[model samples]
Target: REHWATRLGLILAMAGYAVDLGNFLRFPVQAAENGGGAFMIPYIIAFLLVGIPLMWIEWAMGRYGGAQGHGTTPAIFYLLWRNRFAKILGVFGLWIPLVVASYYVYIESWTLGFAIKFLVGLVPEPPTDPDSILRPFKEFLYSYIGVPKGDEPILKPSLFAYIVFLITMFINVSILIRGISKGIERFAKIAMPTLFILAVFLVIRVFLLETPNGTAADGLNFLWTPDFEKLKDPGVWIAAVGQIFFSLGLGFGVLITFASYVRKDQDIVLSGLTAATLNEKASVILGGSISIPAAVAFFGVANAVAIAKAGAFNLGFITLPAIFSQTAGGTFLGFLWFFLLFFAGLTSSIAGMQGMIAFLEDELKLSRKHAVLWTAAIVFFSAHLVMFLNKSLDEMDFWATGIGVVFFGLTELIIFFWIFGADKAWEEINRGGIIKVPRIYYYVMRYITPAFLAVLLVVWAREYTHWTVWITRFYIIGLFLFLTFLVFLAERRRNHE
Candidate 1:
């Protein structure tokens, strides 16, 4: 009875939560940024190496926690150690999702607000099929959400946007407070399919359209006609690896907490692989299918490349919206694209907030309502600091998704490897697993995952220290680890054997 609450929702909801945003937004980004078609190589490699193993860890940990009748943090420390440090570990687990959703909610609000514009045609239509739509969209995202430069254009962030953002936040908080299965399950069922359906519809329509020139070839070439030599770039592999981490929610508490509620009979190792793989396929097939064809059909490959360079990574936000604005079908398709993305954004935000709520309830014995209040307060205040005080939102995202996320993740993994025994953990994995893993799962989990993480660490370290763009990146990562590890060490360890 302890772990039976989720017997009724989309098994895909937990998977979809992490898969939703990063897949749609990040997949095309790394592809275009690393070198159009060639990005697929490293992208696939990371999917295998990084995404799969960590997902297994999350599922295994969750089942163990549930068996103990504990929430995520209590379950982890109860199994790992049982002293005052248990509380500290719980706090880290708690803060992970709290800080994440605060900003994610903010980004989702932008998508939601734009979709509202698409719905009523209340806002002025952006350019459709214009010669240089990418430049404008790129400039627009950077101008408001990005840093200050020269004077921006007449209308950057509209008054309507502020109104929309507040409404979206209210909805997010309300849905999250209603409990996971009741709120989260209902949303993803509708939202995930709707997101895919919209992408499919736009893709079919994009292929059907043509220019006076035969430039309709952009879609096919960007996706299929790859220059294999482009894979030679180390950045391609590093980016693929990072993207894999983000897509699978490896470095985040997403899998850890999501798994905490699983039934004992659940075949979580297989489930982990299934969840990660399904999300990747969605990203590649649905996300790449739409992005490549859209770029080729509307902007052409070169402009698509340029759009990526300027930092409009989200497909619907940066490129696809540019396409929708210009085509004969711009207004309707634009509305569909943004609305679907907005839904996806909301689903993910709620799941993250749930993780924080779990931590508060476990660590402090607070009711879910009070836990959310405390967690939400921290999120609300911290949101402003990242927005106003630090680097612009984009660079801070660099720190979050790039260095900060990865470093904190390594701390968790390293401590697990050194302080806790891998063999002991493996025993737990074997116990709850529905099907036996191939022998390869053992080697891959113990060895290959760490090797690749090191490469990603080195590459990101270089990027963060680039002096011009990301000087603050290292400092932010260091502070998070110093504080987190100090607590991890401060926690008392108990020998269970």
Candidate 2:
């Protein structure tokens, strides 16, 4: 087996990859809009049902493939199912990470750009007049992004941000060229701990903030005090489930490649649980604590509520900047915040990068250099999907992050439990000598998790199937088809060779 340099390195890699921009941005927004403190009811339930079981399954499946001298998704499924059709379905595993990494790098660059903006004092400073802050901040964002309308082109791609994105891509590819033990694991060891300290620092700083007129108290209340009325809305439950899926990297196939490096008898059970613990602490405990409260402290609870409803990017890029401008040592703290986010994005994006590169090497017998070059080329070209077609990015995000994730997860759970045999799956999960998984997970993996996914899918379709944009729908469908075709082409060439 191509094992991790150390067993503990595997756990750190999991945490570092799993805890990304979503932890700092999306989770808090989900909690805030869902039901505040009450949101945990569904979130925890989703964690137990979908999160833990999938984590364990991914580790078990990956190591199972590693034991057979195969790490690529298609090869793994063929071993499990002994059929070409199953291999085709397993292509979902590889396609998603490739597609995800393409756009994910762009987002990582955005974080780097913001960090650079803060350090250079280019970010908007707090106004002497509160009313003056609104117009200029809006202008700053408009000039920065310049999301084009019908015939209008990009007003400003911000050459500064493009330079930052280039640097980010260069750094990511350089790290990926090194093999697993030195590349991903060595980097995670440093990045994960640094990101952790920065998050904890921000959490403490945000909590201790003293805003005039008790707005900070109102903000804290919005977080800790659950409205309870949200339970009635089905959307909250779906959002909770989606957030868990995104936070854990379940549908993304990142864990599969990372876990493939595990030695056969390693304790995936306890390790998976530990990774989940770190992930939840970073996301729910720390993420939920920081952004909204800070925004509320600066901009009142009503406006904070409006921001949360707007979107995660708005909360992070727009609202948080406004909040940071008001703090005493705001500039330095802002640097830490954005830099922390940048590291998180890199860790996650690199994991996806590694997954695709590993696929090329494992299945096609490509050298690491060639694999990195080819993978980098694909991402470099496809990422323009974000730069040129703005709405297409959101459409891809909804499918990749939300719908497609649950779909991939549901497929794998069924394959692992029913087709592979639950009893065999359970034994594989408990292979190493250590922790004892409850008998309940046997049923949970077999029944509960899949059912949860089915319900999520049904509700998601019911909610979004009414979409009026046929062009965006077709674009997403075409992207999926193209990815699947790429997988098929790879398989065919390998078979001929």
Candidate 3:
């Protein structure tokens, strides 16, 4: 199997791939709504129990499977369980990421579209009344790209968003087709540093803004000052873990795919820890610092809180832009922020697509071109269905990122930690170690993490089951069954060979 050309490249790729739009957009809203200053307690606890431990499991599993010439979860499952049924169950890991990448391209493309508009000075100007500041940005998002909210469906694609979507897809495939070391690693090396620098520069600028009220205090206080009363709520706990899950790329198959390229003797313990640490710092610290302060500075605390309630997309597209429109370097800042966002999504989107790429290449023994072409067709066609329909996209996210990923992850943890044997797993994790993994995680990964996921699964279902659009539920499940059958056939073929 191919190996990462350098240790630094692998680490950057893992961190960059893990930190997506969620790190920049979704997490901050979660922080504000749940407990502000108090959110970090559960957030950090969840990170230790679920996020970092799960990272080790996947990294170990990927390297183990990779050593056997497999690049996917099903093959890894079969190796661990030595059963056809486990292989069948492991099919979920592949199915979820492919289905997710299909729609994720559309969301990822929004940044590109916004960036282009900013470049051309086509972004909406600030409204005259302070109260109506978000009106123009909201109109731009709704009319410019035909992005709708609530019940209604859009009649057609926002031509500009579609064009940007195509360009985004093209960039993803172009990078992917270059193969791992040359393509993924190279792009990671470039994107991660750029994202960091831009984020820091913006943070400084955001803090320096001259609002009559102090710029950073209200937002920072809102984010960091924990409302202990909220911590008593179970929903807060679940939300914290969910944020950790998405923020660290825990349940996603992306990490396993990336880790597969790691050489056999590489120290996955340190590597996984390094990537996970970077993800938290980028998501929690930098992500929280940028948006919350900016929103409070310009929109006032009440409006900033209201924006968070409106949804993560609302915060980014509506509130953030409104804040930018009033700033000194608003246009340039808009370009930088959107471009950084684009890079973040591009890395994650590629990681998701790589799951399909690996499945096709390994299971069917197809050439890389054949794999890329097939994956492209599926993602391109599927995304069109959700491009204009906000409800459809929400439903897709509900199933794919929400319930589906958690369930898939829980299954893998049980198989790897219990069935695969904890002691053996521990040894594999430490094999090429640059650092010692604390022995406590042996019990935590085997017991605590599974329990954590089980509770998470139940809580999520209770909270969101009512919102399950039948159309999207059927849409995701249909794809899951179809992909499972395909893998079954490929498994049979490989056995015969």
Candidate 4:
């Protein structure tokens, strides 16, 4: 009925899941690019006001759902009103994670590639100067990331970066599909600490880069010198919500799936709060330490502005590696940074698989082994479609995660509030018997997040609507019909009772 190999293992696994991919590599850079030093204004505010409550909502809902012995759909239907139309929202809840994990695992593949790349003595560096670093790094990209000189990854699946990507993910999925207590707990505990330590190490090392003040302290000044007035910009608010969605695992349903593993009597309040708060703190403190100062010191304010506007995801490949490849200590730091990045990606992949596999087992009643293996098999192969079909696996991952993730967050928030009803849903969150639902949840359910989510979603859609010529309105109609069939079959099988 309950399983946790140990309290420490469970805590580490959950925290590892929550703090995955975004915290280390992406969030810090994104924060620097979007809002500059003032990024923290919206980011910190969103964390307290929006991110935490939502995390509790998802986790408690999952616990409640599991206690009810249901899958994602049945989970929502059990607690929220079932208008039958509610099935659409349930499918969205299920589908978003499905789409996201397909692509997310693709990202983990990138991390996989890099992790294996760490073993090579010949691995290149990140480029600081655009023109100077681009050619060798681009050659390195061809040699490592895009395609390899030969078959056979030094590990197994891929060669260069993407090869290692598959192998690393294979390792992650292989760990998780075995069931939570054995595979999930064991790997998460080991991996999370590896990631956290690496992140702190990067921060310390980066800050030590020399400053005009005669010390390497600009990393601190670069991130912390905030101009609070920029919070008024609409763009900043939108970016904050998006980051909160990512940082807190909004769209992914990872928390729900992972929380289901938590014992009923576990202090959900204490664990959830600690994990969420610590996650935000880790990213903000760590991200700021890495990005702000690096931008100001390496390229200066002008270059930082250009890179931000240009939107450089290749900071690891282009900038950091180049700097490291050039000098004595550069290689070691590059290895550490990329290695930590890989670990972050791997753990998140594990969490996502848990969500997907739980859906299979809880809904379909497959045995644990059958469910885990089946889900992993499908997602593992289906995800590779992006790479074979694209310019770079990174590009494939970028478009998928960027807008895909934003919409995914919006979908989760909508289903939780409007369709589920605020008051009753709060009851579900509280009924988990761990923590009191704060009174403010009533406001989020009734008034707050809907508008906030709407603004974020609409602005993003409108801004990007120009990118599409066919139609900008995405559809889940078939997804809706499929759910109806599932519910109909489910109801019919039971109606004889």
Candidate 5:
């Protein structure tokens, strides 16, 4: 069986998997829009209740299954609950990653393309029209992604954009073909540190800005100041839970796959905690320090809040780029921001792809080369649909990440804690540990984590009733069935052997 070459590499790979685009872009917007400091109250609570607990649970489960020659979720789930139906439910382990990875890599490509544009001086200057400060950046984004103009039916992404997408895809596939330690862990060793270094530079640049409208401290106040009244809103609580859930990349099965690569007696307890804490540091400190303060310093607090509320894509792609254009060394700063995002995005995307690649190799007996090729082919074809179809990327994200992750997470929680027994799972977590997990988490994993997820699911189910939503749901159902058929074939092949 394969194992991580070193513990430090393993932790960095796991942290890279956990730290994602959401850390820098989504977290700040969620904080600004939800309630600022008040948002953080529940955010911290959910991080403890859901994030840390699930991290341990997934790590424990992956290690247990890895020792038994199972790396993918279908096999891992069956190991947990030795039933035919359990394995079928495990198809989600494959489904979520594949679906999410398709559109995710497309978005990753945007960051790379933007970085290139900034480097080449291709990014247009901010328009002189004071009434529409973001107009130039907005048009650039629309054209770059081929967002339809007026009532156009389909997207036609620019040739430059498509070429960059292919380049990004090739990079992921090339890395995957190198196998785990040499490919993923090695890349993380370089990329993760570089990602932080770039973030540090950008944070310093933002802090030093002297804007006409407001100071950088004003932006910090807008993000850190509390409106206690906003805490009364249930949506803010839900948003906090959701942000924590997505930010940590829980329920995606990537953690399980990464953990499966560790030696049977590796210290998952300390390692898991360390990885989770690293993700938090990147999200809460470096991420929070960059965009919100820069926006407020340049545009004033009111405009900054409104820009943030507009959504992560708008804030990151449009508003932030426009702000960068107004500053000295703006092009270089823009390159740094998008390049950091590219590194973060690439790391997570490879982990997402690895879950499926492991399944193909372990269950289907494909060589690593064949497995990587097949997985890349699947994602490449699917990504075209996400790129060309208007609203398809957002719709796919809602189902894959929004609904699928929570549902799969709850399934994992029930199987591991309730069915497998929390006692055994806790033992698995601490099996080779340098640090013992507190006894309280045993109870937390059994009860609180499940309850948090259940509440999030119930609240989320009340909306998105549109016909367009059903189309995406049907798409997900189709993907699920296709994966189930593959699982059945694998089971048959095993029995025949």
Candidate 6:
């Protein structure tokens, strides 16, 4: 069986998997819109109660499965429950990562595309007119993404966007074909530190920035100062939990797949905790420091808060670009920002692909080369659907990460603790540990985590209703059925062998 090249490599790869475009882009926006410091209260609570516990669960589960010669979730689930139905439930483990990666890599391409554009001086210059300073950058963004003009058909992205998409796809496939130790671990050793270095430089620059309207300190205050009154709203709590969930890369099968490659005696307790801590630092400290303060410094507190509340795409592609274009040595700064995003996105996307690739390899008995080829073909076609179909990315994200992820977490928690026995699971978690987990997490995982996820699921079920959402659900259901079929085929193959 495959194993990570070293313990440090394993930790870095796991951390890289957790830190992604969301850390730098989506996180700050979620915090700003959900009441900033008020958001952190629930965020930290969720992290402690749900996020860390799930990390331990996945690592324990994956390592156990790995020792049993199962590298993918379907087979792992079957091994855990010894029931066909349980295996079928594991289909979400395959489906979520694959679907998330389809649109995710396209967004990853955008970061690379923007990075190259900035490097080449192709980004539009800032307008002298303060009244419409962001107009040109906004147009550039709209055109770059190939937004439909009036009645135009939405069948293709811009040529540049398409080219970058292909390039990003190639990069991911190349690394994945190399397998875990050499490809993922080796790359993470380099990429994770570089990502942090770039982030630190950018944070320093943002801190030193001087603007006509506001200081970086003011932005920091807006983000860090608590408005305890905001906590009265349950929506803030829900948003915080959701943010923590996605931010730590919980409920995605990538963690399980990555952990499945561990050696039998490896210390997963410290490793999981270290990776989770690294992810939080990337999200809350580095990510929060850059965009919010920089936006406030350039556009003033009111306008910056408005931009942040608009959504991640608006703040990331439109507002940040406008700010960068106005700064001294803006071109280099813009390149650093987008390239950092590209690195983060690339690491996570490749990690996402591993769960499905492991499925193809372990369950179907395909060679690694053939497995990657199959996974790439699947993503290539699916991504085109995401690219051409308006609103599909949002719809896919809502279903896959937003809804399916939470449901999958709840299901797995039940299976691991209630069905598999919490005592057995807890023993498994600490079997080879370097550090002991507190006794309280056993109760938290068995009771509090499930209750928390159940509440979030109930709240989110009422949050969406639209034709596009149904269309996305149909697509998701179709994918789920197809994966279920694959599981059946794998079962037959196992019997034949």
Residues 21-115, candidate 6: write the lDDT tens digits: 78887888888777778788888998999999988999988998998777777887777788978988899989999999889999999999999
State the lDDT at 147 in candidate 5. Answer: 88
Off by over 4 Å in 2: 126-131, 149-156, 213-215, 465-497
- TM-scores of the candidates are 0.84, 0.93, 0.95, 0.84, 0.97, 0.97
By lDDT, the better pick of 1 and 2 is 2
**lDDT at residue 84 of model 3 (Cα atoms):** 73
lDDT (Cα, tens digit) per residue for candidate 4, span 132-190: 76567656655554443455221122344555555666686678766788787888778
Q: Per-residue alpha-carbon lDDT of model 1 for 57-100, expressed as tens digits?
A: 66776677766655555347546655566555545554455556
Note the Cα lDDT for every prediction shown.
0.63, 0.79, 0.83, 0.62, 0.88, 0.87
Model 3 earns a TM-score of 0.95
How much is 120 displaced in model 3, in angstroms? 1.2
lDDT of 5 by residue, 40-129 (tens): 898999999998998888898899999987788899999889998899889998899999987999999999999999988999885544
| Per-residue lDDT of model 2, residues 1-497, tens digit only | 35688767888899988998888788888888888888988889999988899889888888888777667667777766777678877877877777677678988888788788888788776465445765566666656665554454333467776778789899898888887888888998999888889988998898788766345567777777887899888888888888788899997777877888888888889988998899998886778778877877777776767868878887777767766777887877778888989999888888888777877777767898998989998888777666655565666677676677788888778787788888888888889827978888888898888998999889888877334335456755675687567667777887798
Candidate 4 stretches with Cα past 4 Å from truth are 5-8, 125-130, 147-162, 211-216, 291-296, 300-302, 310-312, 391-421, 432-435, 465-497
- What lDDT score is found at residue 155 in candidate 2? 33
lDDT of 6 at 59: 94
Estimate candidate 2's alpha-carbon lDDT, on a 0 to 1 scale.
0.79
Kindly report which residue stretches of model 1 are placed more than 4 angstroms away from their true locations once superposed. 1-10, 35-37, 73-78, 81-93, 125-158, 213-217, 386-392, 465-497
Clashes of 5: 0
lDDT of 3 at 100: 83
Ranking by lDDT: 5, 6, 3, 2, 1, 4
- lDDT minimum window of 10 residues, candidate 3: 148-157
